[PDB]
Chain A
């Protein structure tokens, strides 16, 4: 119900200048933090923000450490976020010409967090790294910082101009940025910070290093803010005598927009004189107004209509009975199809905590079904109102605790039965061998998985699942442009948008020649249906 973020920024001179093509890492930082914070504020998150500027004149920090926490200035301290801070971030922050110690900024921000602990519910908190590691710093602070992180317990996040691992487009899907062309000062900076953070967390910290580019592509900047969904405890009892009480968790979900769009007057820009209504007139040879309460909700049955009032359906409807996770039977893991999955959300199964008998029971069950490659069938009942479903449950293995994938399954009246001509044996479109070889050339020439070392080395050259849905960020960017520029038209598509969505360029460059062979080998035509703007501002 609360989260705490504190943004400490470097405003030195190295932030200002950068290698051409590898744009100023400070502007990468400002853009990433901007869409971060606007997502925080749009999502009405019960959040909390503190803004600090170090490497700038003065010390807005409450404590200068005997004037040793110098050039450390808190900008907007711990208060509920607003557009003021973000507009200052995008615009009113300017490149500077000097630096300070980032660790001192970290400790004073922690101290500000400590100051703001009373009166307000204190749940969680985070710190993120924004420094190109060219400032001046000591090396004897390791004890105090390690003790603060091991006691004050704030999660850390790193960012770099480069990554831990022309063509370098923006840091999105492009060639890896060099990991050995940096200055040595940045080398000891990265070494010491990675040491301190692995001491904070451990081995998984080694993966916790990221960059501005990574935040652009991946969602680690956004995973440090999180919201758990409610448990759905249920009795997954298997049979008619034994009982198993466990909980349920929505795992995958079509996450849509939550905020609606009111319809507004153009003049008052309000809602009062905008009342939406209908009158429910009556269809006759003459128009006749009829009260809304002069109606019955019938249905089209046969070639006529059977009136079916609510008081009817309410007492002939399907009287289901409560939430349930009973098992119908069992079938082979082959006796299911990806074409056959059904529903709208993957729901993941977990044993209810505080009941370890259920834990061992389901652990045994999942192990067994894993051994037998045998999938189960469950009638999924949600409540006293949701009509039941039928769904498959099968084990999902992982290095941690396993789980049980549950998916809704279709019904006999849900299958759609079409027929299609069999083109595997086409007497009119049998593919030529030249076509076949061109096909093989295209298949092999381009691919998005890098297989090497024969060590199950599967790395996706275009890892999609880590991408968020662009509609939201586009919405937000337009929101900023509109709310900041009352009389300005809509902004462009924010090319970073495409850059995230563009496929790796080396693939198309390498497979263009196979593409040329295709365009040479195959016959193609065109047709109508091209859509255009009618009237255009010629000038």
Chain B
């Protein structure tokens, strides 16, 4: 369903992060700032529908709607805009840190209960459907000790209250993420890992909803309603927009075919459609064109059953289409969808069917292959139970195959290249490869939105790794070209 996963970062300012443990490593402060930059970046080009906010405590001036001390907001919850990154990023670096020490301040006291309360109030201000609320904490301390334990008590109360409210808490290690000197007080508040939040995943995007609700038709009489899902599809560069030269404003577009005979534009009635074959000018209306295209009503005209044992596996027309039963016209549909899938042992017999995605479109044939549920050991479901539509080829599809059967290789070579290939094996993580192009586009767009020239050219294994795998195997393949004359020359 709809909803937004708004999130807010909370950063400590107690001067502990202002120092990098007197070493080469980045300050905790600046590492956190870089993390925030990374999250904005990964947010803008993933879903410009969330909300984000950043507030610093342990401060000198105090900015907030509630005039509380030691609390310094910077951005109330908003859609992540490039302006946010512009303003934030000038605070990073050693120079940004030292000039931030003065433009705002440098460390102070605070009271954790107050900052928690302020963040809660900040969430309350929003006027949207908030799907997931999260406050993730950036701090270097362990806990307040040189305070009254009443402060700690108030903190515990407020934390429990927020947990009641439905507010989800996270905490990040700053001094030595991985050093494991935290959590002698936070053991009962929250319910490192920030490197993950850093530049590890980017250029993503998400969708939620379903495809057309299409009628499954098994007989002329009885009915059954299902749902269609397309669990994969090519991502394209998002469509451009036509600005001005200089107003940077989208320009309108009135658009018709015109006629020189008169100043009045053409008319949809006046427009006619035709095809030319020399002596033939077949004159048609768009309407009769659609009538030509249409054959029957949208739905799944069931053809019959075919055992999975073999249909083919080398043919492909379109990406597969997941099916999930759903009450669309008829209740208890999942009642008939409860079976056909529990045991595919004899249900593997697939379902040849006639498919019609929408109005008037000439149907194809679809292989309604059942795919039973799998469970991941983390109680995670991927490839949910149901069906995948494999589009079925037609006779006109199988274009000409030139016939060339001449020579089979000698068996002394087949085992030898078996030894060759066996050395290299990649598990094929389906997430291990990426479209370089859209990602490059994204990084470019990030560049122009800010003062970055074009400092992004990283490869993501799209290029061959054999630049090192060549020596990985060594050179056994070279003498393993026992073709005496090299095919190359």
Contacts and interface: CB of A to CB of B under 8 A. Distances in A.
B335 A350 contact: no
B407 A360 contact: yes
A364 B483 contact: no
A266 interface: yes
B483 A357 contact: yes
Given A263-B271, A490-B291, A526-B329, A326 B466 contact: yes
A228 B400 contact: yes
A313 B428 CA distance: 32
A417 B206 CA distance: 8
Interface string A251-269: 1111100011111111101
Contacts of B270: 265-267
B338 A426 contact: yes
A523 interface: yes
B305 A448 contact: yes
A266 B271 contact: yes
A539 interface: no
Interface stretch (B126-134, B182-190, B191-199, B388-396): B388-396
A76 interface: no
Main secondary structure of the interface of B (DSSP, over half): loop
A95 interface: no
B293 A460 contact: no
A227 interface: yes
Contacts of A518: 222
B252 A239 contact: no
A423 B334 contact: yes
B266 interface: yes
B463 interface: yes
Given A339-B232, A360-B483, A413-B434, A448 B398 contact: no
Nearest to A376: B421
A: interface residue count bin:
35 or more
Interface string B361-376: 0111100010111000
Interface stretch (B104-112, B162-170, B342-350): B342-350
A302 B244 contact: no
Interface in A288-321: 290, 294-308, 312-313, 316-318
A329 B465 contact: yes
Contacts of A526: 223, 329-330
Contacts of A304: 81-82
A363 B483 CA distance: 13
A88 B445 CA distance: 64
A138 interface: no
Contacts of B221: 519
Contact of B259 (A274, A330, A365): A274
Nearest to B328: A527
Contacts of B314: 346, 396, 405
Contacts of B362: 469-471, 474
Using C-beta atoms within 8 Å of the partner chain, give the interface range for chain B. Answer: 35 or more
A415 B335 contact: no
B234 interface: yes
B241 A298 contact: yes
Nearest to A504: B304
Contacts of A307: 243, 248, 448
Nearest to B408: A363
A483 B280 contact: yes
A295 to B, nearest CB: 5
B145 interface: no
A301 B445 contact: yes
Given A300-B238, A307-B243, A357-B487, A390 B397 contact: no
A151 B238 CA distance: 61
Contacts of B332: 429, 522-524
B352 to A, nearest CB: 6
Given A283-B249, A503-B303, A338 B320 contact: yes
Contacts of B229: 418
Interface-centre pick from B224, B270, B335 (highest chain A CB count, 10 A): B335
B404 A353 contact: yes
B352 A306 contact: no
Contact of B257 (A263, A287, A367, A400): A263
B438 A329 contact: no
A431 B335 contact: yes
Interface stretch (A60-68, A114-122, A240-248): A240-248
Contacts of A242: 477-478, 481, 488
Interface in A203-238: 218-219, 222, 226-229
B335 A429 contact: yes
Contacts, number: 536
A327 B53 CA distance: 45
A475 to B, nearest CB: 6
A269 B320 contact: no
Given A266-B269, A447-B305, A413 B244 contact: no
Contacts of A326: 464, 466
A402 to B, nearest CB: 9
Instruction: Give the most central of B230, B284, B305: most A CB within 10 Å.
Output: B305
Given A240-B466, A525-B329, A519 B222 contact: yes
B384 interface: yes
Contacts of A272: 260
B276 A281 contact: no
Nearest to A367: B414
B87 interface: no
B477 A295 contact: no
Contacts of B61: none
Nearest to A42: B277
Given A251-B399, A252-B399, A275 B257 contact: yes
A335 B428 contact: yes
Interface in B297-348: 303-307, 309-310, 312-320, 322, 324-325, 328-332, 334-342, 346-347
A167 interface: no
A422 interface: yes
A409 B283 CA distance: 43
A497 interface: yes
Interface stretch (A97-105, A189-197, A432-440): A432-440
A523 B388 CA distance: 26
A468 to B, nearest CB: 5
A332 B473 CA distance: 19
Contact of B445 (A222, A227, A299): A299
A304 B257 CA distance: 33
Nearest to A363: B409
B338 A503 contact: no
B487 A361 contact: yes
B483 A422 contact: no
A523 B331 contact: yes
A330 to B, nearest CB: 5
A421 to B, nearest CB: 8
Contact of B260 (A83, A273, A407, A460): A273
A218 B335 contact: no
Interface string B82-93: 110000000000
Contact of B403 (A348, A400, A478): A400
Contacts of B435: 387, 411, 413-414
A303 B48 contact: yes
A342 interface: yes
Given A263-B271, A346-B314, A462-B304, A439 B340 contact: yes
A504 B304 CA distance: 9
A439 B336 CA distance: 9
Interface in B92-124: none
Interface in A321-368: 326-332, 335-346, 348, 350-351, 353, 355-361, 363-365, 367-368
Contact of A276 (B242, B256, B446): B256
Given A263-B272, A280-B252, A412-B430, 10 more contacts: A252-B393, A265-B259, A295-B243, A295-B245, A329-B428, A330-B424, A413-B204, A415-B430, A448-B304, A467-B365
13 contacts: A219-B395, A240-B466, A245-B488, A252-B317, A298-B241, A316-B447, A328-B464, A368-B417, A411-B433, A467-B365, A469-B394, A483-B282, A522-B332
Closest 3 CB pairs of A and B: A364-B409, A329-B426, A240-B470
